Amino acid sequence: VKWECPAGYEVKEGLNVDFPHKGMKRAFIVYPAKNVSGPAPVWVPMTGSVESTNDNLTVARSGANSILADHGYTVIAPVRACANQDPNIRGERCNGPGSNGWNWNPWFEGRAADPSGEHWKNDEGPDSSFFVAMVQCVGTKYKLDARRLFLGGICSGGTMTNRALLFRSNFWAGGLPISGEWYVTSDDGTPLSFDDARAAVAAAPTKIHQGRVGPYPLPAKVGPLIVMTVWGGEKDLWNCTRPDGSRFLCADYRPSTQAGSNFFSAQPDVVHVACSSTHGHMWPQLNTQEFNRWALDTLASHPKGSDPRSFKLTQPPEGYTCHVGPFTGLYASAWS
Template sequence: MAQPSVAIAAAVTWQCPDGYQVHQGLNVDFPHKGMKRSFWVYPPANGASPAPVWVPLTGTVESTNDNLTAPRSGANALMAQEGFMVIGPVRQCADGDPAYAGPRCNGPGTDGWNWKPWNEGRAANASGEPWKQDAGPDASFFQAAIQCAGTRWKLDPERFYIGGISSGGTMTNRALLFDSNFWAGGMPISGEWYVTRDDGAGLSFNDARSLMAANPTDITQGRVGPYPLPARLGPMIVITLWGGNKDLWNCGPSIGLCADYRPSTQASSNFFASQPDVVHVGCSSTHGHMWPQVNTQAFNAWALKTMASHPKGASPKDFVLTPPPDGYQCHIGAFTDHYPERG
């Protein structure tokens, strides 16, 4: 394995907001960008030092607590038993309450954002313009929480990993696209790309689906990241997961089908796989639109250990992909199973 870069490690500053004391468990009233935020801290059970960091993000309809402790939502806090520092951010729309899973977190975004619960993609109209080159306050909050936790626990600056489901997967894509200098990698699960035209203009749901179906290997712009997309990302590893043919989202009887994660995961895999300093692993399963349900904890542990095997600055040529648990098909590179008749 290649040795990580000393320069990258030196760039991380361990600091908390003035007077803030981070601790194990739920941290509240964390000041960031004019807001008071909350996040959970689960230190590694084995006392790993320096510890790799895992930042899991819930989606729209489940709470942060669900994502951390409920088996059907990932139970990501268990990854502390695997030697990871687990930091679970609470969504803005939850007003600091990690148990909140109500309507405030389910619907169109405001202030130029496309969707709640995360600041994960710019709106398609003029209100989204300020976020073409600004990742937004959620992306910087995740980094601030890690930097604060690092004042108390010794964390590995070469092994910061982020991942999430649905809107959390979309937010993962955004964080990686804007801040590839900070993250060593991530796992967007059924995340959006918000495919656009080459000029960054928004497309309707059906037009975006048609564009990817007709051009499944193309690099496409997307409202999930900066416009234009970065010419070159920093070194990292990305595991993109697609939930199979049932990986869809229905917005109710008045709207119907409003999200299809086949084209969005294809688009994200195309871009990440095209980057010379990025290892991209495309994984498919059959669980639909939710946190992976087949051998969940075995998959979580495999995915995190796979990412941790490739620290910041390691050469892509040295990466070795180990077999995933039963129920998952994974390979290095972009997806080839989404549009097999065209891919």
């Protein structure tokens, strides 16, 4: 890791605006770690399609992620590009289909189903690179632990976490993709409809599935990481909204969390923890802060480069079931 900022950019505690990156002006919020001497672990939380970055950071039901600073983590939260640097924007001009080859507008987290997404098959996108530049810049003002840079999020933020881990596995130490998409495709990269992608995983629940969320094809080997994928249970689904206001099912996180767990579990230098709950499709609701503390501290117990064989999972808060490896309680096993 290299600690550097765009020439003349002065990082500060709180809201940072007009951060220059790839022709765009970005913003992010910093909460320095509390009760920590020396380099502090980093948490980069990302909101979803409707919740504002401020909601994700300060509202209990949305995760109140800024509170992790009180837990000894320097929190660096990026604002969505669609929000035009406003940390309070919710779904306005963000909650909907993406443009310029992107599938969803909240984050540059997946290539579109049509040919315009072709280029994103092997270009991480401006969000993935922005987060790296963001952390590297904050690191010039606050002492950050280069072996403990973690990012995560819910919904589209979870999808973005998946993409970031696949394209920058040599930077991040790990992540927490909570109910994020994988956008499963055929092995040859052909985009699949929601229904077809859903059926593909159901027909082969233990295989590694390609996906529009990452590079095509997925990398044969990624850098050292610890990834904790979270599924919200039977109700972990997302209903899109048509221009006329009507709603319709457009995402099921059972296949996407399964697919992610399959890929990361197969990786030799990646410790994958699969967690299941029953809160649905939103930030973990049961013992929320207990979960945030447990999850981040679990990730921090595996600094980048650590031997996966040395990892020791501890019991999660009541309301969660987790274990190392791919998900197992989502689809019936073959031997069954």
